[PDB]
Amino acid sequence: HENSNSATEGSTINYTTINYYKDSYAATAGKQSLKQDPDKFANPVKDIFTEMAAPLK
Amino acid sequence: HENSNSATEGSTINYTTINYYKDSYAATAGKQSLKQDPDKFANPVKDIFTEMAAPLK
Amino acid sequence: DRVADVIESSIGDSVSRALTQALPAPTGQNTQVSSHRLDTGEVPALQAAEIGASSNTSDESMIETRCVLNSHSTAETTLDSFFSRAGLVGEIDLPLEGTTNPNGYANWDIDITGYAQMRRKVELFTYMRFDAEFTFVACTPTGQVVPQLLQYMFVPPGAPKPESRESLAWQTATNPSVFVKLTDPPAQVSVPFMSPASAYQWFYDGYPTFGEHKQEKDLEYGACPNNMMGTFSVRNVGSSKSKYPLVVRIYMRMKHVRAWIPRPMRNQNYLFKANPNYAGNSIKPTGTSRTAITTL
Amino acid sequence: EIGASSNTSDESMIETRCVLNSHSTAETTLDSFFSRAGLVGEIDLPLEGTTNPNGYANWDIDITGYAQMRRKVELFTYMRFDAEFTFVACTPTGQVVPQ
Amino acid sequence: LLQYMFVPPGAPKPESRESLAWQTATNPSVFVKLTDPPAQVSVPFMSPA
Amino acid sequence: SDRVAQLTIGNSTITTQEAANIIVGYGEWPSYCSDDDATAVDKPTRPDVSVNRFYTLDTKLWEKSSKGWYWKFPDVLTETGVFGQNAQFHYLYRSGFCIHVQCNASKFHQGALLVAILPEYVIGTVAGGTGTEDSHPPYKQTQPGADGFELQHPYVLDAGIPISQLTVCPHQWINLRTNNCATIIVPYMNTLPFDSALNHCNFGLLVVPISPLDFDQGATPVIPITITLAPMCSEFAGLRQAVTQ
Amino acid sequence: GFPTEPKPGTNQFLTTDDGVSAPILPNFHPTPCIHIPGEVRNLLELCQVETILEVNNVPTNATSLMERLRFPVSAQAGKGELCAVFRADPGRDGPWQSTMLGQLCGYYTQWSGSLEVTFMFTGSFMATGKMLIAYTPPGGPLPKDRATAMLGTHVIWDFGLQSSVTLVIPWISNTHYRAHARDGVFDYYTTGLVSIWYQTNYVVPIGAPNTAYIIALAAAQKNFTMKLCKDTSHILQTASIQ
Amino acid sequence: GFPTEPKPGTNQFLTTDDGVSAPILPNFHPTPCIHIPGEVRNLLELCQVETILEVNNVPTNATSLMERLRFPVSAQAGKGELCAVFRADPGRDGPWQSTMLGQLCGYYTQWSGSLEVTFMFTGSFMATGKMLIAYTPPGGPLPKDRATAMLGTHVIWDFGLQSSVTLVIPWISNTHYRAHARDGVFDYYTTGLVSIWYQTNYVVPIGAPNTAYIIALAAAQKNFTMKLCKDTSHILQTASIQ
Amino acid sequence: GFPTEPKPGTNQFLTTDDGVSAPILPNFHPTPCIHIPGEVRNLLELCQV
Amino acid sequence: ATAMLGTHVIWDFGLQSSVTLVIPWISNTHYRAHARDGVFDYYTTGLV
Ligand SMILES: Cc1cc(CCCCCCCOc2ccc(C3=NCCO3)cc2)on1
Ligand SMILES: Cc1cc(CCCCCCCOc2ccc(C3=NCCO3)cc2)on1
């Protein structure tokens, strides 16, 4: 059927790859889901504020 | 599934090609739709006239 | 509340008027029956070229015609049909002894205007968008196949261009390289339409610099950076002398083509790449010549 | 000082038109960025020498020996992934031999 | 390595090994090593009759 | 109702009583840039009437031996009028044109001018005659602005291409026994939504005598040819200071 | 592995073979395609556009190259004189080479369809005249006089406001297609001859030029098609592109 | 066996070719993946993070390398003096190379999108001042004075509790994408220039430093994207890794 | 790639082998076939004459 | 070349003997008192 053993196993992203062997890590890199989360690095702030506001109230 | 990234993307013509990779630009040239528009170069006139008529009324 | 001329103001219409539509042309137009027409007022044969439109006179109105069901196809005259034929566009020498490209590596500026056959075809249109299939036929100058390993690396404009056979850029960590033995069938690859413009431009009437434009710089007139795709580098894969003289022929075949703005076909010989210069003294006519318009 | 990147939109900085940005972001994914073969190891099996005669070699699997590839990955602290190793062998002249 | 090129009546017939017609920009050519199995190709009924 | 015509744009109106219809380049009226075709994020300026009007830029004299002339376009209209200004202050420019070339003579005169629009009209040099020298056409030749430039080898349009085929381009003829003016309406044509009006010329206007001017002596011999063009759907973006080139 | 048996043709590189190939840039997405004026779909769209036919392909002085574009016609002193003559073959050497059609033909081995040739008169408004344009099908030797030429397909052109007249050269052939006609043997594919005679005479008042020119423009009719493309012969460079 | 015919490209090793390959360890099951903080999905997530822009890329004394990170601003004695100036091009040599964005660009042939450059003032609380940051689009030569610079996109920055102000460098281009700009010819792809002038003056009471510094931080806007990746040029080693 | 194992007979050119082959002219469309008298279908039609 | 920058009209001679030039009411004021050299040239209409 196919072993579920690739590096992106259980990942939150959905990949569609092609493979010819029992082991899924052999499969192609394939096309995948395009999600992002800039705020994790750009706005890791505890209390969000808006651009419209004055950052320091 | 396949990336939609060939040169004739969004084109008004319909192509039926064969492909084996994720990227659609790899796909064959393939058979395609045969439409034409001679008037764009032959009759780019603002006020059409017919052959039957005298071109300058 | 408004000023009228603002409510009307058709300023901002993103859609193009058109005037002409595209119709299905799978076969050539058929010929319907015609009969004699002796009447005043209708003159098909009479035209006015001044208008700027091609005569629309049908065979039917010029002579009594029979009926012909034209089933001849028009498929072979499409763009993909016409342009999707591999052709030579680049040639590279890797000689043992010489001054051209010793050291075992070469940097070919990706410019398809170096070979007259292919060049003329494309220069038929002003703009052209398409994907392509590049094939690389390598061998010695005698056409002899040799057990040598090469490395072809596409180097986008900005990437570090290899300075030697053992350069660090050959690690090709992000550039796409191809390793091939000259004994393996020619390497072949699919290339997307990679350009910041929407179509490659065979002719660019203008400059790119934006500066003074003196004499010494007229070198840049007609140079459009949206076509400078970077360089193609090749090298025998090693540390020492290749042992065999090599030559790589680069064949490009377009596919998924879109062409726009057809222009006159090249009339004179070609002299330089990306530059329509012609021999001033040797301006030959477009075609053959006779001795008189009254004889063949 | 807060430590967050400015969230000012082009729209609030100048009068802007409307633009339908259909440019893709697929080429900037990780698989997209990292899934490109690169040189990571090199091994010599010379006839005469002191490097690796005797006809065999033991290469410690460490991809940090080649600057191009190394810098790319050292962009992140941690990395999980599968890989495709390819081995291009030949003589020092790039000549292919029946060995 | 050889190069076989089909030259339709009207196309420029090569005058030398290094002739320009070998750019084969529209003519259909086939490049083959004599070590590769014989080249083989499919040809349509091309005639005005 | 086909030989007489009136063109009105901005505050300018052209009249003609012997025109031979109007050609619309590649069968497409000039349009503004779509929201999905554009990239420049700043809201552009559309001066409308202050720049979309009829500028009568130049006059040439047709002589029994004239070779022909050309005018590169985006450029020709710079420095002249409010259009000129918006083209210097802004980086990005976009616009279609209504070109009206006029030239009249008597019913006793004869001749025929070819009036074409050649997109991306790159000029080439004679390469030092022999063809060994890699010369390049000077700024004064590639971007002559108004006044245009005279052709030196019209047969090849000073660019190695047959003029015999120049008609695959929006064209119109000025046959003196038939009309006295040409009218082409070119849409914006480039591989980009906007470009610098300064260093890039979308197309050139060609006016070449294919059938030589001629007339028995005694008939007024001064036969001028006047160019009158009008921008349409002009749009400008990327405002900075004013730039000449 | 899955049992396979490679057939002849293996490893061959066939120029016109249309197959697939490993793509160099994964996930690459091309610049959106803007809308651009005058897009072409089929070369036939171009073959129907009229371009100047160099009927007067005689001058070569390089200072007279421009006069190939038009032929003259002037007050004759007799009856039915011959103005001009030319091969009605498109892919052949001659006047048809100055045309856009002519050039595109050089790229295709065969063609079929009717051709049209519009003749625009550029004389003065005061000049009158009636010409007889005659297309003489295959086998018909170049007519010796008007009275003979007229036995084939023709058209009497009268000078008036309508400057030009078009002569349709109907597709009259034994074969469905025509390979390019070229003197030896291949003259089998010849289209025929076109000759222009003076139906009456070029008339003018005192004060108008006694000689004017006609400009010929040619293209293909709606039923025109071409097949089996090759490379052009008309041209091939000499020096290698610097 | 099943009839097959191998096509050109056979046996070639294409770096970026994404296919399959025989797996070395059958039935192998990788260590479960724990949950780890700060996972990245797309490099664009990084291009939006502001990093220090070395506007003052002048010092090289190796003992003064740290002062490239900030440029000075001090009490002027006149009107509209020029503080600093720089190319607004990201993938070009210059200040942008000290940024994270700059570095990631070196990996992609082209890009598109607006850029943002936040300027944080580090002077004393008592210091007042109004600066005029101006982005001059392509074709606009480096402004000779404030009165000229202001004709382009700009912003008057006032010093207050809100230490920093951001200058957005909107994507104003003729092309949809930009390849890296680099002096010769490729200056076609230049983004423009940024200049900082004194709107008024740096004011201070008796007791505060007569000179302070501004630190520039830059990144890409939400509409920023890059395509067609290559290798960086900015760097390449010399000695081989020991 | 998809795992395959070439069997004997590989690369052999068998005169009477009826397989396919890359076509030289893409989109080529042959001259319509007119109606012609006395068409043959099987040689046996001739053996009875 | 300078005159043409204002309101104009290219007149072509033909059967229609005459052409009319409209001098549109282009003024800052709603009405105009008679224009007359000194100061009152404020009310001038312009030049043809
Ligand atoms: C693997 C591999 C693949 C390659 C080569 C990839 C080449 C992609 C080339 C795309 C070329 O598009 C062009 C468009 C225009 C012009 C041009 N030359 C003069 C001005 O226009 C040349 C090439 O290298 N290695
Ligand atoms: C058949 C066959 C296949 C092979 C090679 C298998 C190699 C698997 C390698 C996985 C490597 O993962 C690495 C992770 C980290 C580092 C590292 N070097 C410095 C610290 O991190 C190197 C490799 O050999 N024979």
Short mmCIF file of C-alpha atoms in Angstrom, two decimals, chain C residues 27-218:
data_model
loop_
_atom_site.label_atom_id
_atom_site.label_comp_id
_atom_site.label_asym_id
_atom_site.label_seq_id
_atom_site.Cartn_x
_atom_site.Cartn_y
_atom_site.Cartn_z
CA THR C 27 -9.96 24.54 -43.33
CA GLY C 28 -9.52 26.97 -46.20
CA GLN C 29 -12.59 28.92 -47.27
CA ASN C 30 -14.89 27.05 -49.62
CA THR C 31 -15.95 28.38 -53.01
CA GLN C 32 -19.67 28.82 -53.61
CA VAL C 33 -21.26 28.99 -57.06
CA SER C 34 -21.18 32.22 -59.04
CA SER C 35 -23.02 33.39 -62.15
CA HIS C 36 -22.81 36.35 -64.51
CA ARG C 37 -23.67 39.73 -63.01
CA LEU C 38 -24.28 42.63 -65.40
CA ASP C 39 -25.40 45.48 -63.19
CA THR C 40 -24.58 49.11 -62.44
CA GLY C 41 -23.85 50.24 -58.91
CA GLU C 42 -22.10 47.17 -57.56
CA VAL C 43 -18.35 47.16 -58.29
CA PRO C 44 -16.40 44.56 -56.28
CA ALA C 45 -13.29 44.73 -58.44
CA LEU C 46 -12.93 48.46 -57.73
CA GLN C 47 -10.98 49.19 -54.56
CA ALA C 48 -9.08 52.04 -52.90
CA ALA C 49 -5.70 51.01 -51.56
CA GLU C 50 -5.36 54.42 -49.94
CA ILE C 51 -7.84 53.38 -47.25
CA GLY C 52 -5.19 50.97 -46.06
CA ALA C 53 -7.21 47.79 -46.22
CA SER C 54 -6.58 44.74 -48.38
CA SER C 55 -8.98 44.19 -51.27
CA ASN C 56 -12.02 42.19 -50.16
CA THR C 57 -12.98 41.07 -53.68
CA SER C 58 -14.10 37.41 -53.75
CA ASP C 59 -13.20 35.02 -56.57
CA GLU C 60 -16.98 34.61 -57.05
CA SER C 61 -17.54 38.23 -58.04
CA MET C 62 -14.57 38.26 -60.42
CA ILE C 63 -15.50 35.23 -62.54
CA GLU C 64 -18.24 32.63 -62.82
CA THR C 65 -17.15 29.99 -60.35
CA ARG C 66 -18.05 26.38 -59.58
CA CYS C 67 -18.56 25.03 -56.09
CA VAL C 68 -15.53 23.73 -54.23
CA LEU C 69 -15.49 22.13 -50.81
CA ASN C 70 -12.12 23.16 -49.47
CA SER C 71 -11.12 20.73 -46.76
CA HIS C 72 -7.44 21.69 -46.86
CA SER C 73 -6.16 22.23 -43.34
CA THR C 74 -4.63 25.32 -41.81
CA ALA C 75 -3.08 23.52 -38.88
CA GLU C 76 0.45 23.60 -40.27
CA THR C 77 0.36 27.41 -40.46
CA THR C 78 -0.21 28.01 -36.74
CA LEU C 79 2.52 29.50 -34.57
CA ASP C 80 3.38 26.38 -32.55
CA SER C 81 3.32 24.54 -35.87
CA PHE C 82 5.62 27.06 -37.58
CA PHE C 83 8.01 27.84 -34.73
CA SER C 84 8.16 24.56 -32.82
CA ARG C 85 11.04 23.13 -34.80
CA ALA C 86 14.46 22.75 -33.22
CA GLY C 87 17.14 24.92 -34.75
CA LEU C 88 20.74 25.90 -34.10
CA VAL C 89 21.11 29.01 -31.96
CA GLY C 90 24.44 28.62 -30.20
CA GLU C 91 27.80 26.95 -30.79
CA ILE C 92 30.64 26.54 -28.29
CA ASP C 93 34.27 25.51 -28.70
CA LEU C 94 36.42 23.87 -26.04
CA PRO C 95 39.71 23.27 -27.93
CA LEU C 96 42.86 21.80 -26.47
CA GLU C 97 45.29 24.27 -28.03
CA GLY C 98 44.14 27.77 -28.88
CA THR C 99 43.06 31.17 -27.59
CA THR C 100 39.29 30.80 -27.88
CA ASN C 101 38.37 28.73 -24.82
CA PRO C 102 41.24 26.72 -23.30
CA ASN C 103 41.31 26.15 -19.55
CA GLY C 104 38.38 23.80 -20.23
CA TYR C 105 35.32 26.03 -19.70
CA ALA C 106 33.17 28.50 -21.64
CA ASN C 107 30.61 31.23 -20.92
CA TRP C 108 28.09 31.66 -23.72
CA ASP C 109 25.90 34.74 -23.51
CA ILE C 110 22.37 33.41 -24.13
CA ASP C 111 21.49 35.31 -27.31
CA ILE C 112 19.68 33.48 -30.14
CA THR C 113 20.43 36.13 -32.74
CA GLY C 114 23.77 34.62 -33.71
CA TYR C 115 22.46 32.25 -36.38
CA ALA C 116 20.72 33.61 -39.49
CA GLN C 117 18.10 30.87 -40.17
CA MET C 118 16.47 30.86 -36.77
CA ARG C 119 17.00 34.60 -36.32
CA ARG C 120 15.10 35.62 -39.45
CA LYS C 121 12.12 33.41 -38.51
CA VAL C 122 11.53 35.03 -35.15
CA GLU C 123 12.36 38.57 -36.32
CA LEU C 124 9.07 38.17 -38.24
CA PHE C 125 7.28 39.43 -35.14
CA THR C 126 8.13 42.22 -32.74
CA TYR C 127 7.09 40.40 -29.56
CA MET C 128 7.09 36.74 -28.69
CA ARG C 129 6.21 34.75 -25.56
CA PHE C 130 6.99 31.03 -25.27
CA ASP C 131 8.55 28.10 -23.50
CA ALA C 132 11.41 26.23 -25.15
CA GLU C 133 13.21 22.92 -25.30
CA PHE C 134 16.98 23.25 -25.40
CA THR C 135 19.03 20.33 -26.69
CA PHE C 136 22.83 20.13 -26.51
CA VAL C 137 24.74 18.11 -29.09
CA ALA C 138 28.37 17.71 -28.04
CA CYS C 139 31.29 15.97 -29.74
CA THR C 140 34.77 16.60 -31.13
CA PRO C 141 35.38 18.75 -34.24
CA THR C 142 35.33 15.62 -36.38
CA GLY C 143 31.86 14.69 -35.25
CA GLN C 144 33.50 11.88 -33.33
CA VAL C 145 31.83 10.76 -30.08
CA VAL C 146 34.15 10.68 -27.08
CA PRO C 147 33.95 9.37 -23.44
CA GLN C 148 34.08 12.79 -21.77
CA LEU C 149 31.97 14.23 -18.97
CA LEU C 150 30.71 17.80 -19.25
CA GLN C 151 28.69 20.03 -17.01
CA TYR C 152 26.24 22.56 -18.41
CA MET C 153 25.11 25.22 -15.95
CA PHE C 154 22.52 27.89 -16.55
CA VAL C 155 23.73 31.07 -14.84
CA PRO C 156 20.91 33.65 -14.33
CA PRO C 157 21.96 37.29 -14.56
CA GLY C 158 23.36 38.04 -11.13
CA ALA C 159 24.66 34.59 -10.27
CA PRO C 160 28.48 34.20 -10.14
CA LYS C 161 29.87 33.43 -13.59
CA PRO C 162 32.61 30.71 -13.47
CA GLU C 163 36.15 32.07 -13.83
CA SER C 164 37.90 28.68 -14.29
CA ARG C 165 37.34 24.97 -14.87
CA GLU C 166 37.71 24.43 -11.12
CA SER C 167 35.73 27.53 -10.09
CA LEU C 168 33.58 27.39 -7.00
CA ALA C 169 30.45 28.29 -8.92
CA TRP C 170 30.43 24.75 -10.32
CA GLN C 171 29.09 23.58 -6.96
CA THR C 172 25.87 24.74 -8.59
CA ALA C 173 23.93 24.77 -5.33
CA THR C 174 20.91 26.65 -6.72
CA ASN C 175 21.69 27.13 -10.41
CA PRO C 176 20.40 24.30 -12.55
CA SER C 177 23.24 22.21 -13.98
CA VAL C 178 23.27 19.14 -16.18
CA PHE C 179 25.99 16.54 -16.12
CA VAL C 180 26.40 14.55 -19.32
CA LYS C 181 28.82 12.16 -20.99
CA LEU C 182 29.41 12.89 -24.67
CA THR C 183 28.50 9.25 -25.23
CA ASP C 184 25.00 9.73 -23.80
CA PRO C 185 22.33 10.99 -26.18
CA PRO C 186 22.22 14.81 -26.32
CA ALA C 187 21.02 16.43 -23.11
CA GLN C 188 17.61 18.03 -23.49
CA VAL C 189 15.73 20.34 -21.17
CA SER C 190 12.45 22.25 -20.82
CA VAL C 191 12.72 26.01 -20.23
CA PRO C 192 9.85 28.29 -19.10
CA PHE C 193 9.16 31.83 -20.27
CA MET C 194 11.48 33.54 -17.85
CA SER C 195 11.42 37.26 -18.29
CA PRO C 196 10.24 40.29 -16.34
CA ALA C 197 8.42 41.48 -19.45
CA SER C 198 5.37 39.66 -20.79
CA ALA C 199 7.09 38.70 -24.03
CA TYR C 200 10.64 38.61 -25.36
CA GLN C 201 11.30 41.61 -27.61
CA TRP C 202 13.30 41.13 -30.79
CA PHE C 203 13.44 44.86 -31.40
CA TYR C 204 13.73 47.50 -28.69
CA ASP C 205 13.75 51.04 -30.11
CA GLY C 206 15.32 52.92 -27.23
CA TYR C 207 17.97 52.83 -24.51
CA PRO C 208 18.08 51.24 -21.04
CA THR C 209 20.55 53.51 -19.20
CA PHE C 210 18.54 56.72 -18.95
CA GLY C 211 21.64 58.95 -18.95
CA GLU C 212 23.47 61.23 -21.42
CA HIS C 213 23.65 59.00 -24.53
CA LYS C 214 26.95 60.21 -26.02
CA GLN C 215 28.86 58.64 -28.91
CA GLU C 216 30.80 56.13 -26.83
CA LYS C 217 27.52 54.81 -25.41
CA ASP C 218 25.48 54.40 -28.61
#
